[PDB]
Write a protein that binds this ligand. Structure first.
Ligand SMILES: [Zn+2]
Length: 46
């Protein structure tokens, strides 16, 4: 997990289902499409 990236902007929208970050709108509108599954027991977290 190095830091080989650089570029500021704005993240008004962020997916919580998977934890993916997005800056555009249309990008999220379609991101939800693939998200057909429902919240199920698996990712054990605190
Ligand atoms: Zn997602």
């Amino acid at each position: 997990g190095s830091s080989g990236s650089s570029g500021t902007g704005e993240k008004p929208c962020k997916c919580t289902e998977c934890g993916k970050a997005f800056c555009w709108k249309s990008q999220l509108i379609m991101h939800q499409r693939t998200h057909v599954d429902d919240k199920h027991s698996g990712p054990s977290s605190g």
